[PDB]
Amino acid sequence: GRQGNKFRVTCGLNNASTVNCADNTGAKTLTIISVKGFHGRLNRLPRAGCGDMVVATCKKGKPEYRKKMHTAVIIRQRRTWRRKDGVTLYFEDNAAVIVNMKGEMKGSAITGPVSKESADLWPKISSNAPTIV
Amino acid sequence: GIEPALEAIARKYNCDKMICRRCYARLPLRATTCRKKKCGHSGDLRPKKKIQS
């Protein structure tokens, strides 16, 4: 579902990392299980940066979302990362929205800003994104 | 859009051959022995299977 390539973003989100769900789909927080497209190495933990599709579970939310595995996209992170034009930037919290494999967003709203890395990769997220930082 | 005349010469280069049941090698029509060494120069051959629409 992703469109185009993504530059290097230093992945600051580990396995078993709890992130907020900025969506409106009754899921409060998600914990990362695996990262789609991650290439394994011995003893390494899966890593996710901005705009990275992940496989996550909801440990806090409505009964129709809790205790189930979902697919999420990382939209912001507290890990400092550098754009190719010499801009060093980082957000205030780690957050993600729930999207499916085709990329179409399940919800219809996003709270707070959205990184340009995630917005350009997934067009459906940018359409629902208030601001793109 | 291929003429039957062009079919005749294209099939012979590709289809009209024998196959060793052990070599799996492509053999001429009148061949009676697996040509390749690994299959032991076997003597059991079958025609190449035709296309069925």
Partner: protein, 193 residues
């Protein structure tokens, strides 16, 4: 088993001159000059005259002679005799190989260089890569008609190999070749004259 003497000969027509120097036959005829080396350490190639017809007269021949030798080595007398025979044909009535192009849906364009020493195959099965296929010295390609080319030359070993080089560059890969009957095929092999 071992044959005491195996002999073969090739007749020289009027317009062909053959000179032999240590298994190095040079043949010069009306069309041009051809040369080859037959480095078999058990053959004796020499010119002579020999009556080859039951009632016909003597005629100039090249005799390929091999004495005591096993059937593995006795089989090369006729091979070399055939090779010299092809030279005489090549320098008198050269060889031409007519190749016809077959495609299913994508037309294939052949871009022949001005000298005729190179060709270009484009849009083969919709591909974007372009195949060049060089030609051996003495072999010339030309566009006979629509979707057809012929190769002109004197040496049957150079002409046939160049034609096979063109076909070998346009094989269909990872597809059922009993359905994708595409490529350049040799329609027939004949003489220029």
């Amino acid at each position: 088993p071992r044959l005491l003497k195996k002999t073969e000969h090739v007749v020289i027509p009027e317009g062909v001159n053959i000179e032999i120097n240590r298994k190095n036959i040079k043949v010069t005829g009306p069309r041009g000059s051809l040369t080859r080396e037959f480095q078999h350490p058990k053959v004796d190639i020499y010119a002579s005259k020999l009556v080859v017809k039951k009632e016909g007269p003597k005629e100039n021949v090249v005799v390929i002679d091999m004495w005591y030798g096993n059937r593995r080595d006795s089989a090369v007398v006729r091979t070399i005799a055939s090779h010299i025979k092809n030279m005489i044909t090549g320098v008198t009535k050269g060889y031409q190989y007519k190749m016809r192009v077959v495609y299913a849906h994508f037309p294939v364009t052949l871009v022949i260089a001005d000298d005729g020493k190179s060709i270009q195959v484009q849009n083969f099965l919709g591909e974007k890569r372009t195949r060049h296929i060089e030609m051996y010295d003495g072999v010339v390609v030309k566009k006979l008609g629509k979707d057809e080319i012929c190769l002109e030359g004197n040496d049957v070993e150079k002409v046939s190999q160049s034609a096979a080089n063109i076909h070998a560059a346009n094989l269909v890969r990872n597809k059922d070749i009993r359905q994708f009957l595409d490529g350049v095929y040799v329609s027939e092999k004949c003489l220029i004259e």
